[PDB]
């Protein structure tokens, strides 16, 4: 009569590596590295990513004019943009602390667009329409941005204009406006008449003044001018003033803003849907609860730690020996 | 292993025994069987699982955060954070690689630790009224039926 | 007779965790995480934070009309602001590289407050007083910042200054002055009457230039103009030259250097103390020898690495089993 | 434990022997009483010892520093920062809470080592003089007095 | 160490032995002799590559990059990369050194396994032919000659 | 008849380190730290550093006249400076985003020097001898910039010029330029004549205005007056447009460039040589597979990770007891 002291065999072929010993089979064993995505651009944290289409964020905010259907937005996780991106600045020029702006808007809760300052009413004594241009063209006419107003000469007359606005929003007012400096001293008279002019903003945390910078310089767009974007965030309460005698591209509408905590901007080609996910990656989401990923280090949410690890196979059971 | 239990004196494992990862066979005048010590693999379950909780529960979960965008004239600003990234990355990566291969030695000698004390559990019980063959198993000099066999791999056994 | 092998036991409840088992007995442990601060802030290497009060660092440096009892320093291992310090820049205005001063004086070793264009004998041939604000108001009455003097026209007339001061003071002289921009065109003539003014700074590693930007904005403490301050760092043997004809808050007071290696400041409430430590926190000084502390990951000093956990104890004695 | 000494087949601890950590019992015509094993008792301290001032002592200490402050147009670097910060935050502390966990573990397996050492050093010691009993006991043949005793736990012994 | 042989029930080594890490000496009728245990020296030695390899080829090496460069107005952003720089500083020391003290310690565990496991696999091979002495050494009652002595060191002795 | 167990011993006297036990002796083991230099600056990927002996990348770039020699390059895989490297900014004043450009041209592939507007043939209308000065001096007699040409007023007239390049180069051109601000108005005449000169350059992605900032500074080189430099990167295609009536140190000489991956600079006196590494050190090369090294925190290439260990021995013997 006998008794046998032993251990479980079975068909697992899981493998993990030890210190000692390469490629170990093991009866029973789990995985601590996602190496799967998604496919999918995800929601996070249950709101759903701005897409702006064949528009970037610049163009999208001063309103180029192929931005006329995402002129839809309310909240937004995080900002996605496509290969398939480059409706921006159309009229050549610099858009300032533009990398900063993208980054404080990458997550926003209440985003109104509105009428800060009213075409046809706000600008008497000065020349509304013929603010357009080839360079910001729309169904091959000439046009311009839908957000900006671009206040030319009235009868060779540019009297120095002086419009303010209060905040009653009760929340951020992302303002924006232009300068725009001509090619030469010629067009800046056909233009704004005043040879020596002056644009002027000014609020409680924003005082700086812009001048007409002209020159020669190659075309851009078929364009010799060039024009500045400048924007700010108006505090609730304040008063935000523009004191200009030409070349200044005035606001015509303004955003409302709650911003974000902190997110970021993912680029990619991937489809959006309406799953959820922690964690957002370029690629796909990653659905993660697994200490490390090997899909992509740049990444949004509560993610797993990024690694170039190829299998990371954590043995729970024994060596298998089933002894065949 | 480390014990010399495992792949050692006891050379191979039972797929016949599939209650348990450690246990008896024993065969009586009343047939053969397998079964598992539901205390000593249970023991070892728990401790599996709490190592497994650890690694992963410990991770202190990201909480948002991307990369960032610079312009053409901040690449001294850039590289600084690729080197920040790059940095985080060659860490994850060795600590992680290197952890999983420590715990996993750990594990399988913990294993080949359960199997050599359930075997001397099971020696120092007998003593002088069975004999050590090998391969973990005791032949009686006194033929035990069931319920003997019960006591034995119960604990209680009991006759110097 | 008998002898028997065995292991130490006692009345110790101590619990470390281990990798296969949570919470567990053991006779003897010590602890490798600081989780205990002081409650005040302490001297860091033998010397001790500078208070500001209710000044922040602007209105020390500035001399804003209330932080005439801090007028109190020698040499200071980092600096220290309190939740009632918002007396600072009280004329309206930005303060250029602000977080930058900030830094560099974080910490210093020899520190002198000095006259360097004194008020009555440097600026004749203009109006050194009525240069004050009600803004800057003192004791209720209009005043002005101590270490800088606003000159006016004097006698509707601003002839060109040249002022100029050497650095014989072998080491570093942090020298602070504005420039005034004043709302409208009206107050530049009745202020600096020359209508196209500019003020000039030059040593020999800074050379800018600064021009009035007059504009309509709204008015921050009752003021529509804004008052720009610069600093610069004068090196030993340099030379700083004041040219202006309007528009120049120039230096009255300037301060001596020599800076610190790199400390920083800490915004908290509580008490500064005569005692001393190796890390302090905003919360208090940690008495730190152990590798881990779980108080605060901003610190100044040598420091425990920050970390989340609750409890790091390490076994040192047995499994304790008393069986009693 | 891993060597299956402490709460294993030596079931419970001492309250009574308190001049170190291992020890012998023991049981004479003369009394029974308590002693420490001296010997090892020392090498385990000093190993604890050293443990212990390993894990404190290799700490690069920081070297002063802070955080930092950036402006309303400095975000991106504000956060570049707090990505470092909190980079460094979840290395130290995945670190921190695994090292002290596997420390653990490895420090209890070696007083349960120790343990087992000392009692198969002194089984190897008595070989057929004594019978071994269990929970660690030996019971002598031959009937010894506080002077033998004193050679067994001294190393002396001597008569196979 | 931990399985108390190395240092411990066999006391020293042997400069004599020169083929390996593990073996035999042996006295026989026809002269002594060393001669190393070929199965389990190579067994160490492939560990302990692999050990040396995972410590050394894991590590993910960097790839190009140096520190960067910074202005007297860059002040801030210059202690940024400092702090990255001395915290990736602190985290490799301390994580480098603790590495190899655990490595170390756990690789010489390893041999004093190794050669524990060796003695008890000759031990349960003689069983009653031979008598246990100490510092790892058989005598036995038959008297057996090199052709024998080679069997026990093969494996295959043969006669419980 | 006896047969025993055992194991080697040797006359190693290598010693490890273990967690229980300090210094302790091994039969065989392995080092993990790297120690030791190499004690020369070497090839970086199979191509050579740049040397520019004892002038700084501005001198190199500008052409100061002491740089005549290091007019030698092609394409390096990064920059070497030395101790005695002072020769750049002669002419005193600010170069503009300098650290930047010297992050950007580390590495180089395809490198070409040429004359982008030819001193005897570009400027007609203007005096473009004369244009040298003291502070620059070769061979003890005045001289200036080799790659820039001081452009100054001919026969009391500067009529504004428009100098434009392409670039068919098919690669980025590297353009450099100042600006010089003269010490008092009384020399802006007598040097470009009209007394409200501008200079302004115009591409694709640059619009930039100038402006003379005439002030009194203390003299750098036994110089009042100042030269701000400035660069750009012209993309292939691009064009670069200089327009100005005053001021205006013009480009003489440009440079063609395919921009490196990304490196660095390294500043020491270590001798260059013709050997190869993947790891380079201020104070000498680093053969390194290794991970870990003691030499330096500072680095460029596939480098250890940086370590303060002075020991990093790793046991693979056993403990070492001969017994002798
Ligand atoms: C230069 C000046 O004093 N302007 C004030 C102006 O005074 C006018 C004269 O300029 C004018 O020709 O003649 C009339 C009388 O017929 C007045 O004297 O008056 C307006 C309207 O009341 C005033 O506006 C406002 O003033 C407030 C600030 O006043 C002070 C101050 O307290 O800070 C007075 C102080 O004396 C003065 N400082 C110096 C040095 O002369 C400053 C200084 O003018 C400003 O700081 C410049 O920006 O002003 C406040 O602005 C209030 O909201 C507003 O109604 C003009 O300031
Ligand atoms: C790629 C490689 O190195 N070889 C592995 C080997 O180590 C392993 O044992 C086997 C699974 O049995 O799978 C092979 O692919
Ligand atoms: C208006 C705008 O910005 N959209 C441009 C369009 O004008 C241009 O012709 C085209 C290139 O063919 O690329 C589009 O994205
Ligand atoms: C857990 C279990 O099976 N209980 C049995 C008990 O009924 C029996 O009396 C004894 C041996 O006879 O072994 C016990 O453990
Ligand atoms: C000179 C000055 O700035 N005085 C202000 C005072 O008007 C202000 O209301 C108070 C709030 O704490 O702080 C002071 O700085
Ligand atoms: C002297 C002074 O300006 N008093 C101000 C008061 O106007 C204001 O109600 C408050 C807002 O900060 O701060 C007080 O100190
Ligand atoms: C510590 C020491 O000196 N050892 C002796 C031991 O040699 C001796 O056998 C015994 C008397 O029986 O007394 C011990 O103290
Ligand atoms: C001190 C000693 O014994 N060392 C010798 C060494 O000098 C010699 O090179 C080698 C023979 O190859 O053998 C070693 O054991
Ligand atoms: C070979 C060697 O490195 N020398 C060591 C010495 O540094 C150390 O202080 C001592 C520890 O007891 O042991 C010596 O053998
Ligand atoms: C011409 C030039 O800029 N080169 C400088 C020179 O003027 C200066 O005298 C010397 C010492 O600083 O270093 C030279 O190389
Ligand atoms: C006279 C003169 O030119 N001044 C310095 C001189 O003090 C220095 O010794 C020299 C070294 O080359 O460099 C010059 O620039
Ligand atoms: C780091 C070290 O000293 N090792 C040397 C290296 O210096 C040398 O350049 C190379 C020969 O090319 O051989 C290596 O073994």
Request: charged share 20%; glycine share 8%; hydrophobic share 30%.
């Given at each position: 009569?006998?008794?046998?002291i032993?251990?479980?065999?079975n068909?697992?072929?899981?493998?993990?590596?030890?210190?000692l010993?390469?490629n170990?089979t093991?009866?029973?064993?789990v995985?601590?590295?996602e190496?799967?995505?998604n496919?999918?651009?995800?929601?996070?944290?249950?709101?759903?990513?701005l897409?702006?289409?064949?528009?970037?964020i610049?163009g999208?905010?001063?309103?180029?004019?192929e931005?006329?259907?995402?002129?839809?937005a309310?909240?937004?996780?995080?900002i996605?943009?496509?290969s398939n991106?480059?409706n921006?600045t159309?009229?050549?020029?610099?858009?300032?602390d533009?990398?900063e702006?993208?980054?404080?808007?990458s997550?926003?809760?209440?985003?109104?667009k509105?009428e800060?300052?009213?075409?046809?009413?706000s600008?008497?004594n000065?020349?509304?329409?013929?603010?357009?241009?080839?360079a910001?063209?729309?169904?091959?006419?000439s046009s311009?941005?839908?957000n900006?107003?671009?206040?030319t000469?009235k009868?060779?007359s540019?009297?120095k204009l002086?419009?303010?606005?209060?905040?009653?929003?009760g929340?951020?007012?992302?303002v924006?406006?232009?300068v725009?400096?001509?090619?030469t001293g010629?067009?800046?008279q056909?233009?704004?008449?005043?040879?020596?002019a002056?644009?002027?903003?000014?609020?409680?945390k924003?005082?700086?003044?812009?001048?007409?910078?002209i020159?020669?310089r190659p075309?851009?767009?078929?364009?010799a001018?060039?024009?500045?974007?400048?924007?700010?965030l108006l505090?609730?309460g304040?008063?935000?003033?523009?004191?200009?005698?030409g070349?200044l591209?005035?606001?015509w509408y303004?955003?409302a803003l709650?911003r974000?905590?902190?997110?970021?901007?993912?680029?990619?080609?991937?489809?959006v849907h309406?799953?959820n996910?922690?964690?957002?990656?370029?690629?796909?989401?990653?659905?993660?609860?697994?200490?490390?990923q090997?899909?992509?280090?740049?990444?949004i949410?509560?993610?797993?730690?990024?690694?170039?690890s190829?299998?990371l196979?954590?043995?729970?059971?024994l060596?298998?020996?089933p002894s065949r | 292993?480390?014990?010399?239990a495992?792949?050692?004196?006891?050379?191979?494992?039972?797929?016949?025994?599939?209650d348990?990862?450690?246990?008896?066979?024993?065969?009586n005048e009343?047939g053969?069987?397998?079964?598992?010590d539901?205390?000593?693999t249970?023991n070892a379950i728990?401790g599996?699982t709490?190592?497994v909780?650890?690694?992963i529960?410990?991770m202190?979960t990201?909480?948002?955060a991307?990369?960032?965008?610079?312009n053409?004239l901040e690449?001294?600003?850039?590289?600084?954070?690729?080197?920040?990234?790059?940095?985080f990355?060659?860490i994850w990566?060795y600590?992680?690689?290197?952890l999983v291969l420590l715990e996993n030695?750990?594990?399988?000698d913990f294993?080949?630790?359960?199997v050599?004390?359930?075997?001397?559990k099971v020696?120092?019980?007998?003593k002088?009224?069975?004999?050590?063959?090998?391969?973990?198993?005791?032949?009686?000099?006194?033929?035990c039926?069931?319920?003997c066999?019960?006591?034995?791999?119960?604990?209680?056994?009991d006759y110097?």
């Amino acid at each position: 009569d006998t008794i046998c002291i032993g251990y479980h065999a079975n068909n697992s072929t899981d493998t993990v590596d030890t210190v000692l010993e390469k490629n170990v089979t093991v009866t029973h064993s789990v995985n601590l590295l996602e190496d799967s995505h998604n496919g999918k651009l995800c929601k996070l944290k249950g709101i759903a990513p701005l897409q702006l289409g064949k528009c970037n964020i610049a163009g999208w905010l001063l309103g180029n004019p192929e931005c006329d259907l995402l002129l839809t937005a309310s909240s937004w996780s995080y900002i996605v943009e496509t290969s398939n991106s480059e409706n921006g600045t159309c009229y050549p020029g610099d858009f300032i602390d533009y990398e900063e702006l993208r980054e404080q808007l990458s997550s926003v809760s209440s985003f109104e667009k509105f009428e800060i300052f009213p075409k046809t009413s706000s600008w008497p004594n000065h020349e509304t329409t013929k603010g357009v241009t080839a360079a910001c063209s729309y169904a091959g006419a000439s046009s311009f941005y839908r957000n900006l107003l671009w206040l030319t000469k009235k009868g060779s007359s540019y009297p120095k204009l002086s419009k303010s606005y209060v905040n009653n929003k009760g929340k951020e007012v992302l303002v924006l406006w232009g300068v725009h400096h001509p090619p030469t001293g010629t067009d800046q008279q056909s233009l704004y008449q005043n040879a020596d002019a002056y644009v002027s903003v000014g609020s409680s945390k924003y005082n700086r003044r812009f001048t007409p910078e002209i020159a020669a310089r190659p075309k851009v767009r078929d364009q010799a001018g060039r024009m500045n974007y400048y924007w700010t965030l108006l505090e609730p309460g304040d008063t935000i003033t523009f004191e200009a005698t030409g070349n200044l591209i005035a606001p015509w509408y303004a955003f409302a803003l709650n911003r974000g905590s902190g997110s970021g901007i993912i680029t990619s080609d991937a489809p959006v849907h309406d799953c959820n996910t922690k964690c957002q990656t370029p690629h796909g989401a990653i659905n993660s609860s697994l200490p490390f990923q090997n899909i992509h280090p740049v990444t949004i949410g509560e993610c797993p730690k990024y690694v170039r690890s190829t299998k990371l196979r954590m043995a729970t059971g024994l060596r298998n020996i089933p002894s065949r | 292993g480390l014990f010399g239990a495992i792949a050692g004196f006891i050379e191979g494992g039972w797929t016949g025994m599939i209650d348990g990862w450690y246990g008896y066979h024993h065969q009586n005048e009343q047939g053969s069987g397998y079964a598992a010590d539901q205390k000593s693999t249970q023991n070892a379950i728990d401790g599996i699982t709490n190592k497994v909780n650890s690694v992963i529960e410990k991770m202190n979960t990201q909480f948002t955060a991307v990369g960032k965008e610079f312009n053409n004239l901040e690449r001294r600003i850039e590289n600084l954070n690729k080197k920040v990234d790059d940095g985080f990355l060659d860490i994850w990566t060795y600590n992680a690689e290197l952890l999983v291969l420590l715990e996993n030695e750990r594990t399988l000698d913990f294993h080949d630790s359960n199997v050599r004390n359930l075997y001397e559990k099971v020696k120092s019980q007998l003593k002088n009224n069975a004999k050590e063959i090998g391969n973990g198993c005791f032949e009686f000099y006194h033929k035990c039926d069931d319920a003997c066999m019960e006591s034995v791999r119960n604990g209680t056994y009991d006759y110097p």
